[PDB]
Write a protein that binds this ligand. Structure first.
Ligand SMILES: Cc1cc2nc3c(=O)[nH]c(=O)nc-3n(C[C@H](O)[C@H](O)[C@H](O)COP(=O)(O)O)c2cc1C
Ligand SMILES: Cc1cc2nc3c(=O)[nH]c(=O)nc-3n(C[C@H](O)[C@H](O)[C@H](O)COP(=O)(O)O)c2cc1C
Ligand SMILES: Cc1cc2nc3c(=O)[nH]c(=O)nc-3n(C[C@H](O)[C@H](O)[C@H](O)COP(=O)(O)O)c2cc1C
Ligand SMILES: Cc1cc2nc3c(=O)[nH]c(=O)nc-3n(C[C@H](O)[C@H](O)[C@H](O)COP(=O)(O)O)c2cc1C
Ligand SMILES: O=C(O)Cc1ccc(O)cc1
Ligand SMILES: O=C(O)Cc1ccc(O)cc1
Ligand SMILES: O=C(O)Cc1ccc(O)cc1
Ligand SMILES: O=C(O)Cc1ccc(O)cc1
Lengths: 399, 399, 400, 399
């Protein structure tokens, strides 16, 4: 039988990653409140998550990685996000960066993983840095904001534009060691506080050529790492869909948790003004139902999309323009549905739910943040899909 | 690769029912306009559909039926509804009634199908009839409204309440021959006109006991026909989810067609007042995108739900309270999503689209009708699900 | 003097107001509604009744026997009227508001129309689809001019066309032509507002002399031939278009207010077909009735406020600045969209019976949606117009 | 000319209260950030607001009060809420309580205002207290949560149920001096932080009969203070619509501020990923337009409702069942519209807007809180109005 309201535990003889997550979930849940005040992921959480081996989800097998399918991974992040969104958000990023790093040169991957098999990277991908072309690579300078999980990473993946005979942008990623940049703690946010999305400061950072890859090359199987793992079901695929798969995952985790949290707290609810046992009133029942349907629909779309990713990777098939536009955008629609489902419950949660001692308030804030990421912006995504559906050339104004 | 915007054609040797539908679809599409003025399904349409054998979708194999899975069937209805909603709606009903008839006695099924293998039933299920208990069965009297496809059926499935010693209702279905009732043509509607949902008039109609089955018995595998087909993947299951699977299917077909129809007509769209070509303006693009996502999400939910039905039928497993509530209600949420997707396009279609010579106007009206059926009413469904999710007893006020 | 949230407040001017006069004839209009829909135009009886109370002279100058009604008072008459028959109200509103434009043309044209026949009106077709040849003394116009609501009952038509510049910039212009100059082609087969008789006008080598041509911009800015004619008027010193197009939203509000009443009437006794439970007062239905009531009351409040703003401007002979003009242009479109939401919310809970030809709900639903299909009520366009103005951007010539 | 986007400044000789608010508004705006960390209204804010005399809005003239009309008052609160919602919310309550106090006995009013003309009350109205009937009054015990502005008030209006020969509830209000209760600082909320809605602790508090009034009596012009001020345009009216007029007022102020704040911050907005200057893109323009229309409509409804209040008060006319239901509920619809308007802008504000250093984030949170008050709950209000519109008896489960 299928499950509409959450992830189905894969019945494979042994313990699946999802079951392993499920066991440590209560611990993650209890750190949530102190995680929020810490403004970064508690060490205990990283320890637990690394212990079960989730960070090796998309690490090549040759280094001791698992090469988990996208669906299985995403479902781990969804479940995790229910306990602490920020932990799930940051840890998802640390995980999915490994998938990108697998498309860089064998030389870089050896450098990261032979040395330390448990090493991970955080990122700052918006190309704000100033790049001087020196020989053997580049010198990069700039303030690189929003690096989720940066405190727990050994490296950072940093985005920049190089240029051209013609002066056209070459969007590129460099991988730099923790020693090359300062973490500037300016992370004071109103949602997903525990993600520790601090800024990375780069001062005359040299990046050699072998630690630089073109974004387009990693979208199209033309990067230095292409072909390294010919038995892999996950590396013959564009980097970005995996890169950014976690946001919507987190959004779904939060929304599914919201429905549970709301149900728990509603049962016993009494009207301040009249003194009525009011938890099972029709309006509240109908809200619970609709939000349940809305996120179930969101889940079905995501599950279908993830399946589409999986099938493509299996066949080493790169997506065509149309499926790529769907992969790029479906997650944003999912995020928008989830936020609707959360808001519908929050609107009926009452004043008590806005107190610091109510989990609902945290879920609400975290849910909204998931739709604030540049990748989950639906105005942008509606335009990207719309243009593709009408056979128009892409608008370079957005990506 | 997966398809977000429509049904995936099943990869089989020879040709699948969906491919057979796809071949005759242009013919069905061209009759659509005269079908709407006919206020019933054109003979040609029934002929074509019976020729490919779709009416034998849920007929037992022993009578030459196909015993199609629910997903495969539902997808045929979706595709069909794109060409002529009314035809798909009525024909879906004729089909799914066979699934119920398979749960009646072997004696009744032999009576219907050994005589005529291509025989079907229309229905009128709301228990408005007055029932006198005679011996050997009942005498039924009353006006039985809304019998979609009644003109093309050899029988009718008719709903009525019998009474229990105490005085509680026994909701029952009787199967009566075309000769026992008069079709009263009062079908003048504003949507799904081609379904020919005329009224059936019953005057002192005797129904013998073997042609009567309890609704609850056919929900729970306790009817006279239970066990007849021990190799069947579709008969060991409640009757009602199949019975009413077509409405949402039709709703999805319409909405997917709406997106295509709107896209076609938008390209060349010119502003009356200013004279600009305006078909690719951002607002329209974003609408096309959003409605595409909305119905894709609607499809994903339906596909998942249909899969759930299929798996249950395979294992001869009757659903528990929870899954049953989801099966009962997911379709209603799907219908609601589709209508939103249609409305979003219609709101931007302009006055032209409201002319009799525009298909959009037909799709809009037909779409809205799909949410007007008592089974797709979402207020009712929100309550049914909500109550179940909170572990409340069902409200007998609705079903 | 308590306020009314759910409909128009009847003005207590001593004696009888136009709204009361509408209210008296409303049951008659309501009963013709069904045959009006099959007629695909306004029944003669309806025009007769409405002209008898004198509503068509709402915006006719007083010198010709006109009333010069304020915009609020007029709009409210159309709202009330739309409850009984949307198509009648839609078409008749247009016949009325055209007189307001005609008052900005030359004294010569107005004399020509109204001294001859004081009860004469114009229908219109304003989208500039015609081909114009500049002859001397005027123009020769050719083309098929679609969608002329109430064209069967009009003595004239107001017809839109582009003339051209030294540099070939468009000069959007309106010509007023007599019924004898054009053929009404009956291609009006629509799925909403059927009774408006929005047939097409066919123009074959129609000569329009200069004095029967006015620039749109001139009538927006108080620079047309008729400017200054009526110095005591509280309604003619104002842009033509806001009055021109005031009726669409009015009709949309009338429909939505009627929908709430119609739904309430039909809901009380509603039984579940399946269970036989007396279900008219169930919480979901009650909450829908409430929300749609609030939504259209909000829509009304916006419209009433906007109409008041129009009235005050006209009183002071003050032309609106860019900002208020953008609000006047667009508020009605938001009102229309709210009303359609309010209707849809009720229709979604109305059940299958409400989609039968013998149910008024179905007519209200269709007519409601049509009101949001007019090029002037398109909200995507309006959102852009307002948005651009709010951010201090130049207007987008792609829309208007 | 009318104003759609804010309050019209009344043209009078001298300076209107709204102009006086407008002059001090920049000061209130600058304290907003430290007000939020203070978790109560800064002394400077109370000082400024009391200096202009706003607290005397609804104080009877005989004590030096202004007896402002509801519209004029409400508009001051709307404007004020734009600078600091919590300040406006708490100060509105201090103001509107005076209006209730005007319906108590002359004896109580003399006691409060002859002594201190600038004295105000905060409140806690939900009847959670345990009441012992002693002679001469009652002894009240209990924890009385959520008293906005309690730190700045000289008194508290406290709600409780007494009983009746037949055991019916008699909902009553008592006015108690600051010395009779302890302010327990448990106010740690996620919105409207600066309102200082701490809890009042009542231990064996004696309330004499003359400081107790029946709620129903103050709804119906039957309380001890009725008739005291026969020239008053505001006191011959139910207490509650004034009592609770400020919530929606605050909600509107926040939403109008949001539009301005969003406009300011959008102009210069660049896409992180593409470097495009993107502040004037169509989707953002359309959002600004729609949110502008939505709150304008919300304003129009409120202004109309306030007008209706004013007219009634002038004529000393108590509202009938129907208008009362509208007065009770319109404000809840207004709040719901405003929250939609804010959410639509927040959804397009991007990640930067969720940082602690962005005002948008404060406006969002504050907006949502305004719809969390028991009085602004729309599910409750939809039910109240719906029942009245259908001529049903009120549901005692809600009020
Ligand atoms: C920001 C905020 C401030 C409030 N201030 C007061 C107050 O000053 N006096 C009062 O009686 N209630 C106040 N209320 C509480 C409400 O009156 C009501 O008791 C509360 O919303 C209980 O509803 P709930 O617990 O179901 O959410 C306030 C509520 C919130 C949202
Ligand atoms: C019910 C209906 C009646 C109309 N009546 C008129 C009319 O009388 N005169 C006119 O110029 N336009 C009329 N219009 C047409 C619009 O002005 C406009 O030209 C039309 O909406 C073109 O928009 P479209 O192409 O997008 O649909 C009417 C439109 C509809 C919805
Ligand atoms: C287009 C249309 C076709 C229908 N066809 C049938 C039918 O074939 N058999 C049946 O029992 N009910 C049919 N129904 C009626 C419903 O089962 C149900 O009795 C009806 O929706 C009553 O709900 P209402 O009167 O409250 O709207 C149909 C309804 C509509 C919308
Ligand atoms: C909670 C949160 C965490 C983020 N973490 C990262 C990150 O780890 N790496 C990164 O490149 N961008 C991260 N982003 C920033 C986005 O990629 C993007 O640069 C940002 O949304 C800029 O959009 P805006 O300023 O227009 O809102 C994060 C954004 C948010 C909402
Ligand atoms: O690739 C993107 O545009 C979204 C993204 C941003 C940061 C990140 O770490 C992964 C994906
Ligand atoms: O079973 C139901 O309640 C819905 C339904 C109605 C008619 C029909 O033919 C099939 C299903
Ligand atoms: O002026 C407009 O653009 C709208 C309009 C169209 C036809 C009409 O008769 C009046 C106004
Ligand atoms: O009267 C109410 O029910 C709402 C309200 C609550 C507290 C308050 O201070 C004023 C009004």
């Amino acid at each position: 039988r299928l499950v509409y309201t959450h992830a189905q535990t894969p019945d494979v003889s042994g313990v699946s990653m999802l079951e392993k997550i499920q066991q440590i979930l209560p611990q993650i849940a209890k750190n949530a409140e102190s995680a929020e005040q810490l403004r970064r992921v508690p060490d205990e959480n990283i320890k637990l998550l690394k212990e079960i081996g989730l960070h090796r989800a998309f690490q090549p097998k040759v280094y001791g990685g698992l090469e988990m399918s996208l669906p299985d991974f995403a479902n781990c992040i969804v479940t995790l996000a229910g306990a602490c969104a920020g932990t799930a958000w940051a840890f998802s990023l640390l995980c999915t960066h490994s998938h990108q790093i697998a498309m860089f040169s064998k030389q870089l991957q050896d450098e990261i993983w032979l040395k330390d098999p448990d090493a991970t990277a955080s990122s700052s991908i918006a190309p704000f840095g100033k790049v001087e072309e020196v020989e053997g690579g580049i010198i990069l300078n700039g303030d690189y904001g929003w690096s989720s999980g940066c405190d727990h990473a050994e490296y950072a993946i940093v985005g920049f534009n190089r240029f051209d005979a013609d002066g056209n942008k070459i969007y590129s990623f460099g991988v730099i060691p923790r020693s090359d940049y300062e973490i500037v703690d300016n992370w004071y946010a109103q949602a997903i506080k525990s993600s520790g999305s601090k800024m990375l400061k780069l001062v005359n950072v040299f990046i050699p050529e072998y630690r630089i890859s073109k974004a387009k090359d990693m979208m199209e199987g033309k990067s230095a790492g292409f072909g390294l793992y010919p038995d892999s079901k996950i590396f013959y695929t564009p980097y970005r869909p995996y890169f950014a798969s976690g946001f919507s995952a987190v959004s779904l985790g939060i929304a599914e948790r919201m429905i549970e949290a709301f149900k728990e707290k509603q049962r016993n609810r009494v009207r301040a003004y009249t003194g009525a046992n009011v938890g099972l009133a029709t309006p509240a029942l109908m809200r619970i139902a609709e939000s349940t349907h809305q996120v179930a629909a969101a889940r079905a779309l995501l599950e279908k999309t993830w399946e589409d990713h999986r099938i493509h990777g299996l066949n080493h098939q790169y997506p065509n323009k149309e499926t790529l536009a769907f992969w790029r955008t479906n997650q944003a629609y999912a995020v928008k549905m989830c936020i609707e489902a959360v808001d519908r419950l929050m609107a009926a949660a009452g004043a008590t739910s806005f107190m610091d001692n109510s989990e609902l308030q945290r879920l609400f804030r975290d849910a909204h943040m998931t739709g604030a990421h540049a990748y989950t912006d639906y105005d942008v995504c509606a335009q990207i899909l719309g243009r593709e559906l009408m056979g128009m050339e892409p608008d370079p104004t957005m990506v």
